[PDB]
Amino acid sequence: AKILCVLYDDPITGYPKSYARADVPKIDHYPGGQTAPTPKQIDFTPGELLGSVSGELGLRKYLEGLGHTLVVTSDKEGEDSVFERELPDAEIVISQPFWPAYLTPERIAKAKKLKLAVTAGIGSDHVDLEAAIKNGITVAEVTYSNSISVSEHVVMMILSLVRNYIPSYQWVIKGGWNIADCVERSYDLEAMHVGTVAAGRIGLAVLKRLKPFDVKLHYFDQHRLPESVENELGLTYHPSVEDMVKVCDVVTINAPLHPGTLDLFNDELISKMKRGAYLVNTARGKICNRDAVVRALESGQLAGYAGDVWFPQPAPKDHPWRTMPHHGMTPHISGTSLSAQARYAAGTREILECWFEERPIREEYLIVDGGKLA
Amino acid sequence: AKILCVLYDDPITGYPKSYARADVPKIDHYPGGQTAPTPKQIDFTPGELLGSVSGELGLRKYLEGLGHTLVVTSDKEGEDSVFERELPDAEIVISQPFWPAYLTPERIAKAKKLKLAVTAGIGSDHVDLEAAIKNGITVAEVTYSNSISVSEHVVMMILSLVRNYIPSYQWVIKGGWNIADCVERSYDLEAMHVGTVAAGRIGLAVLKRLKPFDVKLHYFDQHRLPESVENELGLTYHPSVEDMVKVCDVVTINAPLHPGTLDLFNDELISKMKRGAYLVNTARGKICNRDAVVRALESGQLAGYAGDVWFPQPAPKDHPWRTMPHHGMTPHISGTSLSAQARYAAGTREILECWFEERPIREEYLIVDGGKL
């Protein structure tokens, strides 16, 4: 079989020959008890760069050892890409949400041999599930593999915005000291009101990390959490996003993009936030209306915005979120720390081993099971 | 009375006419139960910039209202500073650790009318206690007023170093995307070994905030914490700093400077850390040997260093911690957020009200009272 694997470019300095650290912590399970991936073996040391083209998710020796072919590329856009060229022949497609190979209905139509699409990471946003279902394609993801990573990135961004970290660091590099310049926008987080949109795996990991900073916690979710969980974390539930944001100093978005959440943070909703609110979004770019964010930061309605998701992706050089005031943005990287890569590469191999041995893929990894379909 | 108050300079864009937000949270008490400052009144809105020259810690109208004179300056250095010229005449001196008016033995000897030295913030590192005792000078500080502020700065710095935040943000600014360049040095904090040097007010606040990150916690302190506290936080105690650093992925220094910690993190100790350790220092600059830190970052012995304390302070333009690789430094600002300023300004006023009314200053604020520790 041919496995077609899209990954991001190597670093501009080439695939790394050395790392800052020799190893990473061994993670054996996630909150709630799901076990970390259990492939029969891995052909990498956890800590190596796996998500880029020369990293190959550590899959080449395994796949070629079985007599299969592995094509890896970063070239994935348009009918004229290496991805589209190689697709007709591919039994399996793998990509990450950080550099996704879109499986649109037209590509799936052209993908004559395709039977399994694996997300190396979490989600299936780049795959058209209706066309997958129609064509008997199994869709799998490595559930929970980077949820904790994202939650850390979120809390890091909250603290950096509220405390005015980045401008302060910049004074150091510029040769300055400028205490008053640093601190005329510097606040503590303590006792601020912080709310999350959605309390899934990431939202709940964020609320747990925020709790000992002694903030007051709020959330909105289409499905209200159990009373024991509200009590444990001291959560105030709100029946809507609007109700919630009126009382929050900080708002974090941890929700999927669906009709209910597209352009949720528009001029009007942002106008209902408290003046000088902080808004963090590691969920989906289009949940926050691009220009409404720029406009609110320019007016001071938002005191800061940060997150790692953009529309489109990659962001063009002229994307206005790059130059708007008071942001703490990164590129889309939160779920692809080296620690997370070790987990999702291991889960990718676990899935592939099940596929080739005709053993069931773990139920929690399966988004659509082609084996259940006619 | 003449109150002589030294504060840092206003922003270079001038004293602010407005702020990013309308108010700050009301802090009623601190962990363990100490109440927040209780002045009879305050003349500022919490959230204003109080620690700069035009902010005056919110004191002018109160002091002038009682007939006193208030002299505010940032010019504090040398025998010919405004500070030094006004000192012989001053009944009270106030300064913050972020821009400290040093009360050395020779300065105390010339301060003929000085009877109260207030730290607007925490500690009395800039005050010669021996000279204060000999001269019957009360020395007071606003205990607990910025301990939490520092602990947040520490955790923020740990996360930023570990996840490679600043270089990733710089790719955005440069017009890049460069995922692999960002993440070839990005790790999760979860399940790393993190240790604190000392577990006082700041080090405990730091451990509590790290706990739900699911790190493995370690500490050294001269006074071992109680077993219930250790069990609750899942702390491993180590009998020396050396013993602890050998196992930590991240180390944070939260200890005072005294002969035991002076130059503690030197070439030899840093060499005993795990390769690619992260070291965060918001305690005192000289606890870390300046050049040893630079050498460790240059060789990769340390993967990253961050902190807000420098030697000397303010950091000269040529200080090498400004240009060493893989740092996340700030200037000395952690305990002077606007939120902390609201607390220590209110506590400074509380102390002055007690003083001018001949009522006892809180026991927890007193470092020296009528010739004795």
Give yes or no for A187 touching B (CB within 8 A).
yes
Nearest to A202 by CA among A116, A101, A305, A282: A282
- Mapped onto helix, strand or coil, the DSSP state of residue A39 is coil
CB-nearest to A190 from B148, B214, B322 is B148
Give yes or no for A112 touching B (CB within 8 A).
no
* Cα pseudo-dihedral B71, B72, B77, B82, rounded to 10: -40
Alpha helix (H) residue ranges in B25-104: 60-65, 82-86
Contacts 24+ apart (CB under 8 A), B33-36: B34/B143, B34/B144, B34/B364, B36/B343, B36/B346
Residue with tokens 């004229």: A80
Q: How far apart are CA A139 and CA A359, in angstroms?
A: 15
- State the smallest CA–CA distance between residue A122 and chain B in angstroms: 16
Catalytic hit among B126, B284, B326, B327: B284
Catalytic hit among B85, B290, B313, B319: B313
Residues of chain A with Cβ-Cβ distance to B161 below 8 Å are none
Q: Is B135 annotated for ligand binding?
A: no
For chain B, helix (H) and strand (E) counts, in that order, are: 13, 12
Q: Compute the C-alpha angle B221/B223/B227, nearest 5°.
A: 95
CB contact under 8 A, A180 and B11: yes
Q: Is A371 annotated for ligand binding?
A: no
Give yes or no for B337 touching A (CB within 8 A).
yes
Residue with tokens 């996840």: B163
Residue with tokens 């009918």: A79
E strand or H helix at A180? helix A179-183
- State the smallest CA–CA distance between residue B31 and chain A in angstroms: 10
B323: amino acid identity, one letter: T
R_g over Cα of chain A: 22
Residues of chain A with Cβ-Cβ distance to B76 below 8 Å are none
The residues in A 54-93 lying below 8 A from B, measured between CB atoms, are none
Q: Residue B118 corresponds to which tokens in the numbers above?
A: 């207030």
CB contact under 8 A, B188 and A152: yes
Q: Where are the domains of chain A?
A: 1-145+336-374, 146-335
Are A266 and A289 contacting, i.e. CB atoms less than 8 angstroms apart? yes
Q: How far apart are CA B280 and CA B265, in angstroms?
A: 11
Give yes or no for B14 touching A (CB within 8 A).
no
Helix, strand and coil in chain A, % to nearest 5: 35, 15, 45
CB contact under 8 A, B180 and A212: no
- Mapped onto helix, strand or coil, the DSSP state of residue B3 is strand
Residues of chain A with Cβ-Cβ distance to B8 below 8 Å are 179-180
Alpha helix (H) residue ranges in chain B: 60-65, 82-86, 105-110, 129-134, 147-163, 165-173, 179-183, 201-210, 227-233, 241-245, 267-272, 290-299, 338-356
E strand or H helix at A160? helix A147-163
Q: Which residues pair with A281 in a beta bridge?
A: A253, A307
For this PDB entry, the determination method is X-ray
User: Catalytic residue at A332?
Assistant: yes
User: Catalytic residue at B29?
Assistant: no
CB-nearest to B99 from A19, A166, A179 is A179
The residues in B 207-226 lying below 8 A from A, measured between CB atoms, are 208-209, 211-214
How many CB pairs (< 8 A) connect A and B?
243
For the beta sheet containing B69-73, the strands, ordered from the edge strand earlier in sequence to the opposite edge, are: B69-73, B2-6, B92-95, B116-119, B138-141, B366-368
* Cα pseudo-dihedral B34, B214, A20, A13, rounded to 10: -110
Are A235 and A229 contacting, i.e. CB atoms less than 8 angstroms apart? yes
E strand or H helix at A353? helix A338-356
Residue B247 burial (10 A CB sphere; 0-12, 13-18, 19+): middle
Distances (CA, A) of A151 to A100, A208, B233: 21, 9, 21
CB contact under 8 A, B178 and A20: no
CB contact under 8 A, A338 and B52: no
User: Catalytic residue at B41?
Assistant: no
CB contact under 8 A, B330 and A16: no
- State the smallest CA–CA distance between residue A108 and chain B in angstroms: 27
